[PDB]
């Protein structure tokens, strides 16, 4: 099964302790807080993340 890096860690940290990660990151995407087009909250929250 394929999934993201951080999701693969947290299942491994829970305690049935039966899942391991092999290999490394196949790529590097990113998580971000998203607002639609025309949302005036997008630019203040973008600076709030920073």
């Amino acid at each position: 099964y394929l999934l993201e890096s951080t999701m693969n860690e947290y299942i491994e940290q829970r305690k049935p302790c039966d899942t391991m990660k092999v290999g490394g990151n196949l790529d590097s995407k990113g998580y971000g807080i998203a607002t639609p087009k025309g949302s005036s909250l997008g630019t203040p929250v973008n600076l709030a993340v920073l």
């Binding site: 990151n25 790529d27 590097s28 995407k29």
Partner: protein, 50 residues
């Protein structure tokens, strides 16, 4: 530190002695402030070499 001089490829670019810089250069926060960047070529990370 203590003098704030852009040394190498950014020494040509920030100080205006060149126009474009096609190079494996890292977009960082203090890099972003002084001069504009393009989109990333590829996604990468810090890797250990032994």
């Amino acid at each position: 530190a203590d003098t704030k001089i852009w040394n190498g490829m950014v020494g040509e670019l920030v100080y205006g002695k060149a126009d474009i810089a096609i190079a494996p250069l890292t977009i960082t926060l203090v890099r972003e402030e002084v001069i504009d960047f393009s989109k990333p070529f590829m996604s990468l990370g810090i890797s250990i070499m032994i």
